[PDB]
């Protein structure tokens, strides 16, 4: 029973650690770039106004 | 070196092929039986050389799968 | 001085301008991401803010 | 037109449907769209018609009614 299972649980953390590292990275590095020009806009945009 | 088993064949599996076990397995498989966790030596030997076993079988087309269930069965391809 | 000043804040706008065209092509295209990530996978798992 | 350019820039900056977006649809409640959200399509907005609004004004918008009648 426990032979089965602790195979089981292997194969599925596995999986599911490096599916996510390798995907959430790359989302974050996009949300990052955009979050990065928005903030250069506003700076420049309450400048300008100013 | 020459006349040696590992020139033709892994070690580990010539020694299930070579077990007491194997043609009533083997025969039992092929009829379509699935193999669960209640019968112990069968299991057991199944557990301990799975991926010979699907290497093997693999020659004639056929996969030997493992449902999460841990039970084994036979599904043959279109070839 | 006001003159030579009217002149960075023209070179600041013509900057903005120019961020704020590339923010709003960023957007355009990480629409469809989010229409796609709907299924519950951004929530938690895929937006780690660590 | 003007009252469906509001509509192109809404939809393709929120990513909503056409048909959710009507003329009182708010956008932080009906349309979802937060704060970042709500920058960005202002800035859109701005971008489509060439033209700039206040601060205040602007963050005053909060509404595709809002929206298209400082636009119009």
Same mark, same amino acid.
């Given at each position: 029973?426990?032979?089965?299972?602790?195979?089981?649980?292997?194969?599925?953390?596995?999986?599911?650690? !490096?599916?996510?590292?390798?995907?959430?990275?790359?989302?974050? &590095?996009?949300?990052? !770039?955009?979050?990065?020009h928005?903030? !250069?806009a506003?700076?420049? &945009?309450? !400048?300008?106004?100013? | 070196?020459?006349?040696?088993?590992?020139?033709?064949?892994?070690?580990?599996?010539?020694?299930?092929?070579?077990?007491?076990?194997?043609? +009533?397995? =083997?025969?039992?498989?092929?009829?379509?039986?699935?193999?669960?966790?209640? =019968?112990? =030596?069968?299991?057991?030997?199944?557990?301990?050389?799975?991926?010979? @076993?699907?290497?093997?079988?693999?020659?004639?087309?056929? +996969? @030997?799968?493992?449902?999460?269930?841990?039970?084994?069965?036979?599904?043959?391809?279109?070839? | 001085?006001?003159?030579?000043?009217?002149?960075?804040?023209?070179?600041?706008?013509?900057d903005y301008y120019q961020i704020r065209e590339q923010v709003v092509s960023a957007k355009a295209?990480?629409?469809?991401?989010?229409?796609?990530?709907?299924?519950?996978?951004?929530?938690?798992?895929?937006?780690?803010?660590? | *037109?003007?009252?469906?350019?509001?509509?192109?820039?809404?939809?393709?900056?929120?990513?909503?449907?056409?048909?959710?977006?009507?003329?009182?649809?708010?956008?932080?409640?009906?349309?979802?769209?937060?704060?970042?959200?709500?920058?960005?399509?202002?800035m859109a907005?701005e971008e489509?018609?060439d033209?700039?609004?206040?601060?205040?004004?602007?963050?005053?918008? *909060?509404?595709?009614?809002?929206?298209?009648?400082?636009?119009?």
């Open positions: 029973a426990i032979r089965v299972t602790q195979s089981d649980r292997d194969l599925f953390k596995h999986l599911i650690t !490096e599916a996510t590292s390798y995907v959430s990275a790359d989302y974050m &590095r996009h949300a990052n !770039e955009r979050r990065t928005l903030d !250069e506003l700076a420049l &945009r309450g !400048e300008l106004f100013g | 070196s020459s006349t040696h088993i590992e020139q033709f064949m892994p070690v580990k599996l010539a020694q299930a092929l070579a077990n007491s076990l194997f043609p +009533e397995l =083997d025969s039992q498989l092929r009829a379509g039986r699935h193999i669960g966790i209640d =019968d112990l =030596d069968n299991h057991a030997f199944l557990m301990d050389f799975q991926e010979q @076993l699907e290497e093997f079988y693999a020659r004639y087309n056929v +996969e @030997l799968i493992r449902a999460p269930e841990g039970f084994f069965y036979l599904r043959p391809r279109s070839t | 001085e006001m003159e030579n000043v009217q002149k960075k804040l023209r070179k600041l706008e013509r295209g990480w629409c469809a991401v989010m229409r796609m990530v709907k299924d519950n996978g951004v929530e938690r798992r895929l937006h780690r803010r660590e | *037109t003007i009252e469906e350019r509001v509509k192109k820039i809404i939809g393709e900056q929120l990513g909503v449907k056409q048909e959710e977006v009507t003329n009182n649809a708010s956008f932080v409640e009906d349309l979802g769209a937060d704060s970042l959200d709500t920058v960005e399509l202002v907005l489509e018609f033209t700039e609004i206040p601060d205040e004004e602007a963050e005053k918008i *909060t509404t595709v009614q809002a929206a298209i009648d400082y636009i119009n």
